[PDB]
Amino acid sequence: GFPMKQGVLLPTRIKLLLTKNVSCYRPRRDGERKRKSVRGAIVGPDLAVLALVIVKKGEQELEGLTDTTVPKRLGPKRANNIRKFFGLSKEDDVRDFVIRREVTKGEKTYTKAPKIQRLVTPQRLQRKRHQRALKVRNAQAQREAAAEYAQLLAKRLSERKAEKAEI
Amino acid sequence: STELTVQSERAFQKQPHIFNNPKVKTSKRTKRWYKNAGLGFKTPKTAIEGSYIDKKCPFTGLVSIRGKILTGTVVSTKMHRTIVIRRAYLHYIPKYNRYEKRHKNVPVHVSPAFRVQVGDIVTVGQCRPISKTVRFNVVKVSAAAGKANKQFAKF
Amino acid sequence: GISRDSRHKRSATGAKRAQFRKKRKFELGRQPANTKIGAKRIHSVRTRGGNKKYRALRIETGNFSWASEGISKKTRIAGVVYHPSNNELVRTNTLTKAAIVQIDATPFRQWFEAHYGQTLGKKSKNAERKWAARAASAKIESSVESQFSAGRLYACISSRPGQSGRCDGYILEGEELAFYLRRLTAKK
Amino acid sequence: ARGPKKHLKRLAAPHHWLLDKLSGCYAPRPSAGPHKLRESLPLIVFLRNRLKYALNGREVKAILMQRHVKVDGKVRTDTTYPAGFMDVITLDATNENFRLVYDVKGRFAVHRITDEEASYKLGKVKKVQLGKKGVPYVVTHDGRTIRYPDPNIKVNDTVKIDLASGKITDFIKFDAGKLVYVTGGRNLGRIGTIVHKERHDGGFDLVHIKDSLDNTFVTRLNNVFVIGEQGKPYISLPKGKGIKLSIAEERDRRRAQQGL
RNA sequence: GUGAACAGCCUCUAGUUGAUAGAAUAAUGUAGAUAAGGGAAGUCGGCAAAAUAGAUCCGUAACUUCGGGAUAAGGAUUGGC
RNA sequence: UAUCUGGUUGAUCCUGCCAGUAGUCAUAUGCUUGUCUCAAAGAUUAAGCCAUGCAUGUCUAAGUAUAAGCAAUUUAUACAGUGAAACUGCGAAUGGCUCAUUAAAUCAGUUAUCGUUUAUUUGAUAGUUCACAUGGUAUAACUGUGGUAAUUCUAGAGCUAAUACAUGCUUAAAAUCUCGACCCUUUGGAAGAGAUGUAUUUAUUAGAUAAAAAAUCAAUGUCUUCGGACUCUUUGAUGAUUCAUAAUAACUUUUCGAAUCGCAUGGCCUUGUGCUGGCGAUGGUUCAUUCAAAUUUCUGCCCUAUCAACUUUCGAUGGUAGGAUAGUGGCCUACCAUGGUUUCAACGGGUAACGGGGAAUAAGGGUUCGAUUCCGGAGAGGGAGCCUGAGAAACGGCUACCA
RNA sequence: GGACUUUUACUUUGAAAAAAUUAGAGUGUUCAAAGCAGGCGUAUUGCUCGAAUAUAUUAGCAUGGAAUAAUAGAAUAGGACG
RNA sequence: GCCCGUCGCUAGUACCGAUUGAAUGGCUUAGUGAGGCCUCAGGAUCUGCCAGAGCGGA
Numbered sequence A: 001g002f003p004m005k006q007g008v009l010l011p012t013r014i015k016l017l018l019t020k021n022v023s024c025y026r027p028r029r030d031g032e033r034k035r036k037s038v039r040g041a042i043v044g045p046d047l048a049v050l051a052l053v054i055v056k057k058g059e060q061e062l063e064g065l066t067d068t069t070v071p072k073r074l075g076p077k078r079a080n081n082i083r084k085f086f087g088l089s090k091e092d093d094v095r096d097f098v099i100r101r102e103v104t105k106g107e108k109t110y111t112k113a114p115k116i117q118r119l120v121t122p123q124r125l126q127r128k129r130h131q132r133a134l135k136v137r138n139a140q141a142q143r144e145a146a147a148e149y150a151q152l153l154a155k156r157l158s159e160r161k162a163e164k165a166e167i
Numbered sequence B: 001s002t003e004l005t006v007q008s009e010r011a012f013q014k015q016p017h018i019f020n021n022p023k024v025k026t027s028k029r030t031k032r033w034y035k036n037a038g039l040g041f042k043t044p045k046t047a048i049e050g051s052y053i054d055k056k057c058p059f060t061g062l063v064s065i066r067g068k069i070l071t072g073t074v075v076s077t078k079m080h081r082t083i084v085i086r087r088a089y090l091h092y093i094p095k096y097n098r099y100e101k102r103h104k105n106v107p108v109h110v111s112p113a114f115r116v117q118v119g120d121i122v123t124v125g126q127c128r129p130i131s132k133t134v135r136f137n138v139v140k141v142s143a144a145a146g147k148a149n150k151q152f153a154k155f
Numbered sequence C: 001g002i003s004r005d006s007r008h009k010r011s012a013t014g015a016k017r018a019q020f021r022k023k024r025k026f027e028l029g030r031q032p033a034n035t036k037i038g039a040k041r042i043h044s045v046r047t048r049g050g051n052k053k054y055r056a057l058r059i060e061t062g063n064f065s066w067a068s069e070g071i072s073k074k075t076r077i078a079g080v081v082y083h084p085s086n087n088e089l090v091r092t093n094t095l096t097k098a099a100i101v102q103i104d105a106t107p108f109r110q111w112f113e114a115h116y117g118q119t120l121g122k123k124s125k126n127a128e129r130k131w132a133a134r135a136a137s138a139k140i141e142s143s144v145e146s147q148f149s150a151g152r153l154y155a156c157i158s159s160r161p162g163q164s165g166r167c168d169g170y171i172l173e174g175e176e177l178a179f180y181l182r183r184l185t186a187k188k
Numbered sequence D: 001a002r003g004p005k006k007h008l009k010r011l012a013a014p015h016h017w018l019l020d021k022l023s024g025c026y027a028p029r030p031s032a033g034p035h036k037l038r039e040s041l042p043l044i045v046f047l048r049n050r051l052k053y054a055l056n057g058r059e060v061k062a063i064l065m066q067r068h069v070k071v072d073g074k075v076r077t078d079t080t081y082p083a084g085f086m087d088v089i090t091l092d093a094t095n096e097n098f099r100l101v102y103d104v105k106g107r108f109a110v111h112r113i114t115d116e117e118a119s120y121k122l123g124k125v126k127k128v129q130l131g132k133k134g135v136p137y138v139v140t141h142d143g144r145t146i147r148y149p150d151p152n153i154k155v156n157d158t159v160k161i162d163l164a165s166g167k168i169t170d171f172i173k174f175d176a177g178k179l180v181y182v183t184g185g186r187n188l189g190r191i192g193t194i195v196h197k198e199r200h201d202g203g204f205d206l207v208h209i210k211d212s213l214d215n216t217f218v219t220r221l222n223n224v225f226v227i228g229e230q231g232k233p234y235i236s237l238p239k240g241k242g243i244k245l246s247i248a249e250e251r252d253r254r255r256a257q258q259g260l
Numbered sequence E: 001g002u003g004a005a006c007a008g009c010c011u012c013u014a015g016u017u018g019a020u021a022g023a024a025u026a027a028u029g030u031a032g033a034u035a036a037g038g039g040a041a042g043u044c045g046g047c048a049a050a051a052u053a054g055a056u057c058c059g060u061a062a063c064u065u066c067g068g069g070a071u072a073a074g075g076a077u078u079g080g081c
Numbered sequence F: 001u002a003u004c005u006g007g008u009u010g011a012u013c014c015u016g017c018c019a020g021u022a023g024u025c026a027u028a029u030g031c032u033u034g035u036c037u038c039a040a041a042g043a044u045u046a047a048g049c050c051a052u053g054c055a056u057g058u059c060u061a062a063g064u065a066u067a068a069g070c071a072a073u074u075u076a077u078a079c080a081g082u083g084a085a086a087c088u089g090c091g092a093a094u095g096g097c098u099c100a101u102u103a104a105a106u107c108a109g110u111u112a113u114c115g116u117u118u119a120u121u122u123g124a125u126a127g128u129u130c131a132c133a134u135g136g137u138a139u140a141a142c143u144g145u146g147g148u149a150a151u152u153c154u155a156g157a158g159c160u161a162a163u164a165c166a167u168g169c170u171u172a173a174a175a176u177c178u179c180g181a182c183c184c185u186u187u188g189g190a191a192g193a194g195a196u197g198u199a200u201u202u203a204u205u206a207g208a209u210a211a212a213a214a215a216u217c218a219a220u221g222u223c224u225u226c227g228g229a230c231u232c233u234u235u236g237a238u239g240a241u242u243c244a245u246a247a248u249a250a251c252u253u254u255u256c257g258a259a260u261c262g263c264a265u266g267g268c269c270u271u272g273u274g275c276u277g278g279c280g281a282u283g284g285u286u287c288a289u290u291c292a293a294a295u296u297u298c299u300g301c302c303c304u305a306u307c308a309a310c311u312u313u314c315g316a317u318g319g320u321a322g323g324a325u326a327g328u329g330g331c332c333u334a335c336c337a338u339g340g341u342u343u344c345a346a347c348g349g350g351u352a353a354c355g356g357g358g359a360a361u362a363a364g365g366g367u368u369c370g371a372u373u374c375c376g377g378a379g380a381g382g383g384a385g386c387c388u389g390a391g392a393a394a395c396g397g398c399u400a401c402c403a
Numbered sequence G: 001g002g003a004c005u006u007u008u009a010c011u012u013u014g015a016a017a018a019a020a021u022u023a024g025a026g027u028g029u030u031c032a033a034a035g036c037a038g039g040c041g042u043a044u045u046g047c048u049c050g051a052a053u054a055u056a057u058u059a060g061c062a063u064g065g066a067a068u069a070a071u072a073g074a075a076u077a078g079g080a081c082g
Numbered sequence H: 001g002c003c004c005g006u007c008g009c010u011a012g013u014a015c016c017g018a019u020u021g022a023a024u025g026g027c028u029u030a031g032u033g034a035g036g037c038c039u040c041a042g043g044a045u046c047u048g049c050c051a052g053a054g055c056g057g058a
């Protein structure tokens, strides 16, 4: 049952150290590395099973493979992803261009669809406008508070020059 | 110790960030930074008049004196730019209601501001760790002779 | 791994100390960068508390200041002529703090003969203006001057390249450049 | 020991909390915040043991999660929040306003104030530093960073604070003859008047104090919190106003008037 | 010349190339070699044989007539440029 | 709460022990056992070994839902209720257990950080960046086709998201700097062009005060009442700094400066789906604060000389330089010096030794104990090594060895 | 703030000192070991005392003391004051 | 009367003692040396700035 991990260049099974972001290993803790037993990448009589992907068709259709056909699972979700599945540029208003899936509860047959993420909304510009707002509205108020000091200290120095008259 | 060569190390010895501009011609040569260590301690003249370098000198160097301050007499001058003092003290045994003589030998780095001799009492301020042994630094020298003169020639 | 603990070593009395507890990740130490010249390549140590550090090895360029000219220009590093710690660093041309290199002089020569116009060693309207407001300060030093003919200037590395990833420093000048000048050709 | 400790065993709990030996295992651990672990009251010890409004801890959260509690105007929904000296706890139901302040015996007091007095509070400047880009900032025993202050404010002084905004509305210097609050030391909780301060270059300035019964003592400069000018406190003092009768003079007060 | 050396190995001067000869290459011999794994089981007996080996640096027990035992034992190192 | 009695002689008074007597927050054992309240307990031997179960998980109006999930009705042809799984985040470094180690170690009281790191909490802090009606893919769950006696093992194929992954726009006023096309001869003056947030590395300048005045040399500031003249604008903290902070020249596989989410939806016309705006969530750099951490100053241990010299192969003591670390430091490395401890007991050996709070015994003085409910330290069979992370040299994490 | 100061032992006082333990005030857990509670009316809409105190020592810091006991000084004056 | 030493019976404890004795625990020269980490490389296949080409990223 030991899988093939490409890159080893061996007919033989060898043990390795497996990490995040490599196959044959599903790390069960943060930073967990585990020593597992990988089967080599070169084919041999020793394999119970082999995995093959068809690069080109052939003069004979194959029963459960070329003859039949499957649907994809889910349609585009991200806005521009629907936009670039259908090729709509940014005008065409991808809302009604979302894909919808049916289902039926005891003749009640119903509808559902994605929620288009990274959609441009009126709500979403209200925040953007608000952010450039706070940042400038804050900016100047600190300049005035700075002038309150430049007045408080400079008019403290006009108290210190006028007390020289008391001397 | 110290007391010549100023440059004797393969490294060029200099104070950090104290710059003598070559184009601006000075008749004093060296521009020498110092401070007063504080805690009511005179930064001595020789720290200013001196030509020396050492960065473990609490007056011209980058170590700061803080924490304990200690009295003790110098038993060993044998190390260059550090020395060991014997601070004695008495220990009270409650059962017998008496005292027993103890001592603790404190290595302390002596800046080359001072000429220290064996037998001279010394005041010593605490500083950051300097060497493996030395957490303390010579600050004030309390004995200028310690019988040195009473030995004299015949006549 | 490496441990900077004093729990090893010995007493001041010269007593063997027993092994107490274990190594902790916070007593830790790491390998020397042994940073070199050529082909900039740098790895980043992730240190205690976030705090990336930057491992120089193979840096061919760094920012060097002209001490008495108040200006700084990045150059090439041409080698290492000296080092106070181990001579093997000069031989291997390894880059460390207080390591004596040679740099370029051309970014400094391009800038001096612009800011001044005095053509080391060897017409515009407002140009001759400030050129004349200058000089009197154009004398420099014979020992920095004569260097410029060779096309390489004696600098000193003031940074920690394995720590900071940058090789920076100042041009040897005045008393330092005078001193290394002795050991430089009293060793060579 | 491999990390920060997240519990408190209820013995090592600070005793000015006045928590009973049994009935539990652990104290609540005061969270990080304005006030230090040793010196602080968590709202749970307040809303439960002091004010007896909440019997559980379960009730203390079921309360705080209604926003009812708030400190210095902010709502403060965290149970272990490290409330402490000078803090103003305002229940909007019951319209109660408390300032957290010390008895003479050294604990925190349950001491009410007006709807008005609630809106300002003192704090002691713990250092005066020049911040980034020139702005000098002052910072207080309760952890408030306040910028653009009066250059005549120095360390160990005290400050009036707005609590709506945070600005300084007045500053009381540290000079001989000021009303003073003792936070820390055995004398903690005693009050007022500062006869002298002994220098001691090298740390730990001693401060003599005389209350007005004309009793005298000393504490650390660090333990001196300037509360105002002689005879006039800037905030409402509690019953007894930090005098300290001896165990006999407190024995006659109890063995005479109240009750029998 | 190598080297501690008048050792061994190679050389210069000189002096020989003298000792029956040819052709084969069985056994058995004389003289010299090497043997997988085991390691004295062989044998009166380790007979024979093998292993050791120089230098530089480290390290060295009983015991002793204190002179020794000692190269004890046991280690590391070694070219070229 | 200051107590003795019995035992050597034929008798005697002594020495001196045995024995008697008393208590024990001290274990064990034996006989016997009705009640209330309180409640220690596999420490001592063996930190010896372990079957099984359980002991660490986690979601708000508010980072990602198209479950082929349930459920609504009830407004939602993008979504919206509720919500397994999975991604994202955080936690898993606390707790709990044990005392093996450990005798200048730990620990305790007392110091130090002008020697360092710190998630978080709390308080401050951001107009400066070159499709902005908001830019790119690449994946789990899932789907389906699979291998193995065997595990929280996973392979191949087909989808699809983000506060994951990786990119990348933006904003006022002014000012100081450099360059500088021209004309201009005079103390000469100039349109216009760039640069300037923050963070990083370096170097240089400021960061004054110790009481008062003068000539000269180069550069070069601000006023002419045209010869000359000229500042009482900066002055922060500490016992003390190269400190806080500031400025100049550059440097950078440029750190950060919101491509985020919940509620509500209200103005304002010059009517463009134009331009605005509420209550708060999560973030984000720096500084402080807090929660911590790591070192650290003085002084303090049991028995032992049938342990008297110890330390420096191969760091012992110190210097210089670099490397390294979060940082100081022989922490390591090069060259250099010959140093450091001890009869005031070093060094060594032992400890049926973790240290402290405390415990028993009640003239005082002492003696004896403390594995154990609190603090500190160590460890998770023995050793080392390490990933993740603010935090571990973690063990209910991994890797290796030995068992 | 400047400029200097022979250094010690001792004894005074103080500041800084975890809880629990202990000593001990308060409170009638029905007594009691305990515990730190509780105690009062107008017991249908509240009032209110509490949770004291002391011990902590050797060392460290701060301070009054100048006896007892050490310590240094002027003699080949290289002495003191100006 | 008391009383001593060899000799002799019985029991117990310790000592010396060939076995170049044995065991436990801890340090250690030398030899060999897993492992992760740093570093010099490498480059199953897969992307960057439909004949094809340059130099950076995974």
Ligand SMILES: CN[C@@H]1[C@@H](O)[C@@H](O[C@@H]2[C@@H](O)[C@H](O[C@H]3O[C@H](CN)CC[C@H]3N)[C@@H](N)C[C@H]2N)OC[C@]1(C)O
Pocket: F009
């Ligand atoms: C061997 N014979 C005995 C020996 O057994 C021993 O006996 C005495 C005995 O005589 C004493 O006791 C005698 O004398 C006492 C005089 N007051 C009274 C009691 C009586 N039995 C005992 N107290 C002690 C023994 N060790 O001492 C004396 C002895 C003669 O040597």
Ligand SMILES: [Mg+2]
Pocket: C050, C051
């Ligand atoms: Mg940081």
Ligand SMILES: [Mg+2]
Pocket: D200, D202, D203, D204, D205
């Ligand atoms: Mg102070």
Ligand SMILES: [Mg+2]
Pocket: D202, D203
């Ligand atoms: Mg201090």
Ligand SMILES: [Mg+2]
Pocket: none
């Ligand atoms: Mg020879």
Ligand SMILES: [Mg+2]
Pocket: none
């Ligand atoms: Mg020969």
Ligand SMILES: [Mg+2]
Pocket: none
């Ligand atoms: Mg012939």
Ligand SMILES: [Mg+2]
Pocket: E019
């Ligand atoms: Mg013959």
Ligand SMILES: [Mg+2]
Pocket: none
């Ligand atoms: Mg023949």
Ligand SMILES: [Mg+2]
Pocket: none
């Ligand atoms: Mg023939």
Ligand SMILES: [Mg+2]
Pocket: E025
């Ligand atoms: Mg033959």
Ligand SMILES: [Mg+2]
Pocket: E034
């Ligand atoms: Mg052969």
Ligand SMILES: [Mg+2]
Pocket: none
């Ligand atoms: Mg063989």
Ligand SMILES: [Mg+2]
Pocket: none
């Ligand atoms: Mg063999």
Ligand SMILES: [Mg+2]
Pocket: E039
């Ligand atoms: Mg053999």
Ligand SMILES: [Mg+2]
Pocket: E040
């Ligand atoms: Mg044989």
